A paper describes a structure:
Based on their homology to ATP binding cassette (ABC) transmembrane transporters and the Rad50 DNA damage repair protein, the two globular [name] “head” domains situated at the ends of ∼50-nm-long intra-molecular coiled coils of a heterodimer of condensin’s Smc2 and Smc4 subunits are thought to sandwich a pair of ATP molecules between composite catalytic sites, each composed of Walker A (P loop) and Walker B motifs of one head and a so-called ABC signature motif of the opposite head. Each head domain (hd) can be subdivided into a “RecA”-like lobe that contains the ATP-binding pocket and a “helical” lobe that merges into the coiled coils; they connect the heads to a half-doughnut-shaped “hinge” dimerization domain. Smc2hd and Smc4hd are furthermore connected by their binding to opposite ends of the Brn1Cnd2/NCAPH kleisin subunit (Onn et al., 2007).
To reveal the interaction between the [name] kleisin and [name] HEAT-repeat subunits at near-atomic resolution, we solved the co-crystal structure of Ct [name] bound to Ct Brn1225–418 to 3.3-Å resolution (Ct [name]-Brn1Y4). The structure revealed a hook-shaped conformation of the 21 HEAT-repeat motifs of [name], with the low-affinity binding region of the kleisin subunit (Ct Brn1241–299) winding along the concave surface of the HEAT-repeat solenoid and entirely filling the space between the two lobes of the sharp U-turn in the C-terminal part of the [name] subunit. A marked drop in the quality of the electron density map in the second lobe because of crystallographic disorder only allowed modeling of a polyalanine chain into unaccounted electron density alongside the tip of the [name] U-turn, which presumably corresponds to the high-affinity kleisin core binding region. A feature apparently unique to [name] is an α-helical extension of HEAT-repeat motif 10 (“proboscis”), which showed, however, no apparent primary sequence conservation among [name] homologs.
Residue numbers in the entry: 241 to 274, 278 to 299
Write the structure that this text describes.
Amino acid sequence: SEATLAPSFASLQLKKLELEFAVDPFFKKASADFGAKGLLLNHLMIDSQGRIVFDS
């Protein structure tokens, strides 16, 4: 069983996961809502500070 087993579990380890990506939900909604009626400023929403929110 010596050579069939691996030692320490570090030989079967890993530390970098394939954590696909983050894509923003505002982007996903803007894709669905936008041509000339989804002008991308009709589409957007205002903010409490007083800006246009595309980045979450």
